[PDB]
Design a protein around this ligand. Structure first.
Ligand SMILES: *[C@H](C)[C@H]1/C(=C/c2[nH]c(/C=C3N=C(/C=C4\NC(=O)C(CC)=C4C)C(C)=C\3CCC(=O)O)c(CCC(=O)O)c2C)NC(=O)[C@@H]1C
Ligand SMILES: CCC1=C(C)/C(=C/C2=NC(=C\c3[nH]c(/C=C4\NC(=O)[C@H](C)[C@H]4CC)c(C)c3CCC(=O)O)/C(CCC(=O)O)=C2C)NC1=O
Ligand SMILES: CCC1=C(C)/C(=C/C2=NC(=C\c3[nH]c(/C=C4\NC(=O)[C@H](C)[C@H]4CC)c(C)c3CCC(=O)O)/C(CCC(=O)O)=C2C)NC1=O
Ligand SMILES: CCC1=C(C)/C(=C/C2=NC(=C\c3[nH]c(/C=C4\NC(=O)[C@H](C)[C@H]4CC)c(C)c3CCC(=O)O)/C(CCC(=O)O)=C2C)NC1=O
Ligand SMILES: CCC1=C(C)/C(=C/C2=NC(=C\c3[nH]c(/C=C4\NC(=O)[C@H](C)[C@H]4CC)c(C)c3CCC(=O)O)/C(CCC(=O)O)=C2C)NC1=O
Ligand SMILES: CCC1=C(C)/C(=C/C2=NC(=C\c3[nH]c(/C=C4\NC(=O)[C@H](C)[C@H]4CC)c(C)c3CCC(=O)O)/C(CCC(=O)O)=C2C)NC1=O
Ligand SMILES: CCC1=C(C)/C(=C/C2=NC(=C\c3[nH]c(/C=C4\NC(=O)[C@H](C)[C@H]4CC)c(C)c3CCC(=O)O)/C(CCC(=O)O)=C2C)NC1=O
Ligand SMILES: CCC1=C(C)/C(=C/C2=NC(=C\c3[nH]c(/C=C4\NC(=O)[C@H](C)[C@H]4CC)c(C)c3CCC(=O)O)/C(CCC(=O)O)=C2C)NC1=O
Ligand SMILES: CCC1=C(C)/C(=C/C2=NC(=C\c3[nH]c(/C=C4\NC(=O)[C@H](C)[C@H]4CC)c(C)c3CCC(=O)O)/C(CCC(=O)O)=C2C)NC1=O
Lengths: 148, 161, 65, 49, 50, 49, 160, 169, 161, 161, 161, 161, 160
């Protein structure tokens, strides 16, 4: 409808509150009746995608707007905008230092990794080289080898 | 998104076969339980806010999460928590009516773990809140309707954990 | 229910953004439920509303929209 | 702010305007553009939806 | 140290969160408090002796 | 410290316009094959090369 | 036409006509003489085109003229040859205009809905335009037959 | 966004305590140096388009390849994009100079800047050296204008180039 | 998105050099092949639906994928398959006209593997369908135009695999 | 992991510049505060267990969390709580000695929120415990050493919340 | 991992109360059913491979999944399927002996849905295989031991679905 | 991981059919190109370090990325960059020998984008480095062996972008 | 640095800093003034150090500047002096930090792999740092030359 991704966390807060009150009907009602749709498109023009040549882009919303301006975007089943906007202010996540795909499932026979090619669920996070992950000891606990 | 009927038809169609006696028996089971599903859905639609507020009064109230520092602290966070619990009860009602939990992992459990892990939402406390919601609605609608509600409540808690 | 409205909305932002032109002074059927936010938005952009007329309403009903 | 040097050097997007004066295939191509933009794929001519 | 086959010593919080906080594996203290379960005082007072 | 990140695929904005790019992108943003006169525009760009 | 298409395609883009589009219009303006010669070739011999193409069509697809088909009887066969005359006229318009927007914008948009409402097999209409193309490209020189067969090709392609 | 005041407010809010002696002393420390930040901000609002150009020419005197052939500030499109980027850095440096906290820089500048620059081919290194050419220009200009302390001027550009910085140590 | 001309200009500009004799020779090669590219593009625009339906009639018809259980089973899946093959032929025509496959990995091969792997689309069957489309269009436009079509068809099959 | 010296060197190196007067002034500030940092670190190393047990005696003792149902109930949970508080005091001492909180978000605050949210650990109660630990050690080492301890204690509480 | 005894003790301990009469009655119920649990576990340990092969002979044999294209096609996939069914029967025996399904969602149902969804394993066909295994073992051990086996078999099928 | 032979066999097996004439023709094409593949693999194994260092000397040297602030700055980062380019050349040699790029998206392109995005590695600069490596090895082994190397180099650059 | 190393070494051991490590940090904190004086001595005269050390190196090892060597030509000799400037800068960093973790953690880990990929003899680089050490310890007082020669010694030791 607007031709761009949500560019802030307060925007996702506001429009999920609108979705929560009144479904798809009130979501489209609140999106079309903005000042944004009326300023960019008016009453005659079809909405269009606004990439990095059409207008001024923002660095905070960049890697997720790049997702949305693709055709694989209805297959990113994971909400990307709210997760990056919430996880910007928090500390680092519980993901593997390199990528978020090398976290195997902890079952008895592994080789089960969430592959990047089946579902897009990619949360890269900048880990430095001297980070240490926090692990839960399988045992009593007080012999967690960082401390005993 | 598919109920018991659409899943039976999808199995018989992916086979390419006609509806044999086992499919007829499955559909007869659903067509016997459907009136109980309807009455439990009406009774749950009666008392949405009461079931939600009794679930918070059982689990989340007077604990650390409503105190300062908790993730349910502010009024914005309290309102979003009531909204999330209303979502869980509403979609559990939908999955009870369909008789199939495909709507739950299609539309609740899809990116919910990653959303809650990005926000900092405690998953164990919300699992206990959904369990208390299940306990309250099973006290509301009876034994067997409470059980067929609790199977989808346990589905939501298992996909969340 | 629908309002057959007629309004003229100058943008006052096309000089800064340098966009191409949409023709103003429209005549459109707005649904009744979001006619509110639409009239308010036309007042937000500063545009004058020429004519408001109820098209499909049959005013004074209680059900049946 | 985006400089004009960045905008004229860009993949210029066609803006589809619905004027009531237009010729009939033009309204057809503009409605086709709206079906392509909202539904992300042209849902008519590929499903007749 | 050349006497024992390895064994799974550490979980990630993702794997522990997967296995323990599932509903059948769950305890009932784990995340919010539980109140005490006494009987009603009018039933206790209505008995036949202290 | 920045604590999160989005997936940065490299994006190449068009640095300038040439003719076959212009006609291919025009026929593309309307989601159709190149029509006959587009191909003539390309053809007389090629003969004049 | 070519000028309409170039003007509209520059018009949505909020720009003037690019110089490549301008030499496109210039080349079409120079080739208009050969376009008018192909148009006179198609116009002057329309009787033999429609007659021979109807003959070869009913030879090729005899069931539509057999009892039970659409074009059975005197007036139905006359209406069938009239529809073929309509399509040859649109072919002449598309030859002059240098593009298929006359042909598409007049007689190809709702052609499936119309011929489904009439009860007509559209493949037999495609065979009618195929026989018209055979007679017409049998009537001209090589490049003239190619330039007319482009528009005949568009009509048979827009059928199916 | 957060200034220093809303930083102290969010700091005291998460524990649920009122302001002590030290919170009032830190609020007095922001309110006492407030006028200094505001005349520095007004003196920057004097010569913003001059300071951005001067820091740009000093950066291009530092790294000379970017004006030359293979560099990323090559054409006038790239030159104007680089000067608009330096205008962004000075603008949000002024905003963080007035706010006294680095949360505006974190939320609106530094979050995901490296992604855009690594993708587009924009280098991150002369960007940082240009940011602190801006910092050095602002610092000597405001030290020339009678202002004794320059630690608050030191704050935001040093933060912005501790964040775009590559940790190799 | 760049043709042979724009890629030559981009190489000479990233060098910072003027257009030397090797760039002149590359542009002369493109300006000699361009008329053949134009005529092959017109001939391919003539027979889009015929080339697509002959590719399905060669590879995908009467196999298991059009039977029940296959990914080309339903009418929705058949229509989406015809749509995908029309996309491959259209973008191969564009890459033939430009003389550079940058549009293919910019706008076809970008997220296509992950989309097809998320949907469950067989990649080998669609690679065989694109190969039969290549064989049909190389029978259509001749030897050398078929070869310069097949280089971009092989580019699409290599990026898909 | 970097102190004030290594962060100053990293800023001057990412600039590519030599150490100018502002870096010299920052290092002079650290080299003036370092002796106070050393003496406060010795005084905190003196009384680790006393500061931890006084923090539990101020906040967590005789509340609901040490009662049945609390997360600090069992002896295993009590020992793990004392272990966690000893970790917070030890790493706050390290960040006080370095003069930079990079070790705290590198090695404490990395996966701590997700660990505590998966276990069911109350974050508000442990934030109050860290605040009481800060209050006790600021009573121990004085005003300004207590302040430069409390800035990293507030860093741990902010990253935990 | 907890049986009926450990769950009763955990409830009475999380209460902090002593074992009252309801806990005594629950433990008396388990100590009455335990001999039947022991004899059914011995009878199931007798015929592991027979119950597994009769479950495959009832459900999965001669269907499409053992034909080409099915997920049970190859000998590797057949051996892994027999291994998975032996796992389901073994852990259902363990949950029958404990009298509590905590081992099932601790050690079977933990990442099983995501594993099967990543591999491409059909969940409905394996649910039908577990149901036929339940039917065969309930024919083996009798009515009530078959019922107390089928409650944990239904637990595995519910957590898998 | 499958070559052209194993992919042909897998297609004929998923069909369930025997090897018809099209499969025989595909295997004849591979058995004609295999000697050229062998000789190009030997020639590439001859000059691994030379091709890598000429690729860095063409693209990455004397640019900003080897200067301070660049991601190729330190000696650790330089050694890891040489290590990454040696990986790309080695796996492109493997995919050239197999005649199928399945090893590339199985073992290079699997988590490479997310790794490079988490580390801060520029993807465009490494794509230009792989392109210069392709240009150097196509100058080394000739026209057609350079083309059949460059198809897998373009596969790596497309999956990386 | 010293503080990083002491903090990490107490950090793995799950203990606080031992008092011996604390007086180690205290002695380094007191000797920081002499460290900064050695750093200003090394920083202010970098031109003469790099120039004289390059002169003595190419006098000592003339084959690397002869045709056939790595540093042959104008820009190659300029890059050679630039690499020597890099190593003198890392020497200054290690002098200030009181430990060799800046030098090792920046420019000594993959030095063998890098200089093998460039085609460089590493012994001639060790001779370059040897001549830099000779010029630098010829520039200072006795204990200052010993304290700087410790880090120069570490660089030449980490080469071979
Ligand atoms: C200039 C000194 C340096 C430089 C700059 C450069 N940048 C770009 C392109 C973009 N820069 C941005 C930057 C921002 N967007 C933001 O929202 C913020 C925070 C307020 C910043 C810092 C963006 C989004 C772009 C993309 C263009 C757009 O705005 O849509 C270029 C152009 C790159 C190209 O080739 O197209 C240049 C040249 N480059 C240098 O060399 C200097 C180090
Ligand atoms: C060095 C950085 C670092 C930290 C901080 C860390 C914490 C950490 N604390 C843990 C547990 C714990 N932490 C607590 C602490 C608390 N619960 C409460 O109720 C109180 C409010 C609070 C103490 C003040 C408890 C009770 C457990 C045990 C949970 C359990 O056994 O179920 C665990 C679970 C595994 C184990 O006990 O050994 C980890 C990994 N790990 C690390 O690597
Ligand atoms: C210029 C664009 C244009 C077209 C194409 C057009 C077609 C058209 N064809 C008609 C009938 C017809 N057209 C046909 C034609 C055919 N049936 C066959 O079997 C043959 C395959 C084929 C011709 C070769 C027949 C048989 C009818 C009569 C249908 C009826 O009587 O029910 C009619 C209804 C009667 C009339 O008013 O003429 C229209 C409007 N009108 C237009 O304006
Ligand atoms: C491809 C077309 C094109 C051109 C020409 C171009 C020029 C250009 N000339 C520049 C500056 C300059 N150009 C000149 C000089 C001159 N300028 C002239 O056109 C005269 C021939 C000459 C004076 C007689 C000077 C003296 C500067 C430095 C300006 C400054 O100090 O900012 C700059 C600023 C960066 C720099 O210092 O080089 C650009 C981008 N950009 C382009 O994209
Ligand atoms: C369940 C929804 C569904 C439908 C409808 C479907 C149709 C379908 N019909 C086909 C062929 C066909 N279907 C027909 C049928 C007819 N032709 C006539 O003349 C009659 C009017 C009509 C039937 C009474 C014919 C002749 C073919 C063969 C086409 C050919 O060989 O070119 C094929 C290709 C070969 C194959 O794999 O079977 C498909 C996929 N597939 C589906 O999944
Ligand atoms: C322009 C670049 C581009 C391409 C290529 C593209 C493909 C694309 N193909 C899709 C589906 C599809 N693609 C196929 C195609 C096939 N499955 C088979 O069995 C055959 C082997 C093969 C056809 C030869 C099918 C059957 C679907 C539908 C999947 C479904 O509905 O579940 C979808 C799912 C969404 C939708 O149908 O509309 C996308 C986005 N999108 C793009 O933007
Ligand atoms: C103890 C708890 C536990 C379970 C249950 C478990 C299952 C499990 N089943 C697997 C595979 C499998 N499971 C099946 C089973 C089936 N597919 C079908 O078509 C049938 C419907 C169904 C059998 C009834 C097959 C065929 C595979 C092999 C998949 C493959 O090789 O591609 C794998 C893949 C790795 C490997 O084979 O060794 C795991 C981890 N792991 C565990 O730790
Ligand atoms: C076999 C498949 C595979 C690949 C490819 C792979 C890459 C990979 N490259 C890495 C780092 C790296 N990769 C580069 C490479 C580059 N940066 C640049 O500036 C250049 C443009 C580019 C080289 C051409 C650099 C500099 C690092 C080090 C980052 C750092 O130390 O901060 C890392 C970080 C951990 C480590 O260095 O050892 C991984 C895992 N891992 C794999 O398993
Ligand atoms: C701070 C740690 C650090 C070091 C050491 C470093 C070295 C380094 N030395 C290089 C080249 C070089 N370095 C030398 C140096 C020498 N050859 C000789 O014969 C002499 C023995 C010796 C110097 C006295 C030469 C000749 C080259 C050019 C190699 C070539 O052009 O192939 C290059 C490639 C071009 C460049 O981007 O500068 C790097 C990255 N980079 C770093 O970040």
């Amino acid at each position: 409808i607007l031709g761009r991704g949500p560019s802030s966390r307060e925007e996702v807060q506001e429009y999920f509150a609108i979705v929560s009150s009144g479904g798809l009907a009130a979501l489209v009602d609140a999106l079309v009746d903005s000042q944004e749709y009326a300023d960019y498109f008016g009453e005659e023009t079809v909405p269009y995608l606004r990439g990095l040549g059409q207008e001024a882009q923002e660095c905070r919303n960049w890697g997720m707007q790049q997702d949305l301006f693709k055709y694989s975007a209805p297959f990113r089943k994971v909400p990307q905008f709210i997760t990056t906007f919430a996880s910007y202010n928090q500390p680092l996540p519980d993901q593997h230092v390199y990528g978020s795909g090398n976290d195997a499932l902890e079952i008895q026979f592994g080789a089960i990794f969430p592959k990047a090619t089946r579902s897009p669920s990619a949360s890269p996070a900048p880990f430095n080289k001297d980070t240490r992950r926090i692990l839960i000891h399988r045992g009593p606990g007080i012999n967690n080898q960082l401390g005993n | 998104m598919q109920d018991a009927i659409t899943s039976v038809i999808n199995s018989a169609d992916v086979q390419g076969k006609y509806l044999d006696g086992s499919a007829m028996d499955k559909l007869k089971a659903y067509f016997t339980t459907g009136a109980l599903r309807v009455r439990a859905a009406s009774t749950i639609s009666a008392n949405a806010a009461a079931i939600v507020k009794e679930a918070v009064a059982k689990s989340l109230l007077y604990s650390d999460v409503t105190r300062p520092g908790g993730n349910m602290y502010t009024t914005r966070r309290y309102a979003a928590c009531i909204r999330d619990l209303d979502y869980y009860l509403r979609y559990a009602t939908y999955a009870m009516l369909a008789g199939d939990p495909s709507i739950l992992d299609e539309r609740v459990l899809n990116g919910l773990k990653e959303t809650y892990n990005s926000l900092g939402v405690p998953v164990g406390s919300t699992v206990q809140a959904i369990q208390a919601m299940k306990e309250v609605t099973a006290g509301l609608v009876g034994a067997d309707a409470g059980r067929e509600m609790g199977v989808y409540f346990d589905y939501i808690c298992s996909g969340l954990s | 229910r629908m309002f057959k409205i007629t309004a003229c909305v100058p943008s006052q932002s096309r000089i800064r953004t340098q966009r191409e032109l949409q023709n103003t002074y429209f005549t459109k059927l707005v649904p009744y439920d979001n006619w509110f936010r639409e009239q308010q938005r036309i007042m937000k952009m500063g545009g004058k509303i020429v004519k408001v007329q109820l098209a499909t309403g049959k005013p004074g009903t209680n059900t049946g929209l | 702010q985006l400089p004009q040097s960045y905008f004229n050097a860009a993949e210029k997007r066609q803006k589809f305007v619905m004027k009531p004066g237009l010729s009939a295939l033009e309204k057809n191509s503009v409605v086709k553009a709206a079906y392509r933009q909202i539904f992300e794929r042209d849902i008519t001519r590929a499903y007749s939806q | 140290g050349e006497d024992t086959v390895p064994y799974e010593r550490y979980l990630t919080p993702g794997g522990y969160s997967l296995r323990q906080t599932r509903p059948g594996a769950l305890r009932e203290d784990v995340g919010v408090k539980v109140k005490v379960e006494k009987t009603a005082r009018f039933i206790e007072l209505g008995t036949s002796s202290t | 410290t920045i604590k999160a990140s989005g997936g940065s695929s490299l994006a190449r904005p068009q640095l300038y316009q040439t003719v076959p790019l212009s006609n291919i992108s025009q026929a593309e943003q309307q989601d159709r094959y190149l029509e006959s006169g587009e191909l003539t525009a390309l053809k007389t760009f090629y003969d004049s090369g | 036409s070519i000028v309409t298409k170039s003007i509209v395609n520059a018009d949505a883009e909020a720009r003037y006509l690019s110089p490549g589009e301008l030499d496109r219009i210039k080349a079409f303006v120079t080739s208009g003489e050969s376009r008018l010669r192909i148009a006179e070739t198609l116009t002057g011999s329309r009787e033999r085109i429609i007659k021979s193409a109807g003959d070869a069509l009913f030879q090729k697809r005899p069931d539509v003229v057999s009892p039970g088909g659409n074009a059975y009887g005197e007036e139905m066969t006359a209406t069938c040859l009239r529809d073929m005359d309509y399509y040859l006229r649109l072919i002449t318009y598309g030859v002059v205009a240098g593009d298929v927007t006359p042909i598409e914008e007049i007689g190809l948009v709702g052609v499936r809905e119309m011929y489904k409402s009439l009860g007509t097999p559209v493949d037999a209409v495609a065979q009618a335009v195929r026989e018209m193309k055979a007679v017409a490209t049998g009537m001209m020189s090589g490049d003239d037959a190619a330039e007319a067969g482009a528009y005949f090709d568009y009509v048979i392609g827009a059928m199916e | 966004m957060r200034d220093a005041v809303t930083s102290l407010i969010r700091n005291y809010d998460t524990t649920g305590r009122y302001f002590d002696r030290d919170a009032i002393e830190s609020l007095k420390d922001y309110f006492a140096s407030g006028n200094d930040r505001i005349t520095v901000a007004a003196m920057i609002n004097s010569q913003s388009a001059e300071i951005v150009k001067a820091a740009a020419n000093s950066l291009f005197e530092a790294v000379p390849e970017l004006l030359l052939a293979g560099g990323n500030a090559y054409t006038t499109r790239r030159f104007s994009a680089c000067l608009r980027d330096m205008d962004y850095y000075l603008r949000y440096g002024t905003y963080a100079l007035i706010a006294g906290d680095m949360d505006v820089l974190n939320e609106r500048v530094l979050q995901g800047l490296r992604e855009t620059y690594n993708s587009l081919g924009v280098p991150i290194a002369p960007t940082v050296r240009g940011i602190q050419f801006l910092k050095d220009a602002i610092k000597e200009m405001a030290a020339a204008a009678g202002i004794a302390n320059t630690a608050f001027i030191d704050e935001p550009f040093d933060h912005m180039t501790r964040e775009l910085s590559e940790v190799d140590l």
